[PDB]
Amino acid sequence: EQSICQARAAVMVYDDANKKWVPAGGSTGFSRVHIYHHTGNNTFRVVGRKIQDHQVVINCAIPKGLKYNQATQTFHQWRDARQVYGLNFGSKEDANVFASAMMHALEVL
């Protein structure tokens, strides 16, 4: 697996029952978020680890056809059949880097 981008963001998941965003892994703070490319079968995954204690807070597949919503210039989100994910980026540059890699992955899938 090869990393195609690194971006700083607070990883959130939506708690629909309470209509509230909550920190991924239950750990508030920023993470280093990668998109990893597995060339063997041309698959991509979003993997993020807390800057402080290195806990993996997100490890989710990027499926072909995903709708990646750039809600704001610093908060992007997407959903799968089970959860809604949100990335509150530390800067617009981080958001642009990550969106570029995401949009690339969705183009080559």
Partner: peptide, 8 residues
């Protein structure tokens, strides 16, 4: 798709 400091 859902739309705070309280949450952060």
């Amino acid at each position: 798709x859902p739309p705070t400091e309280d949450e952060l």
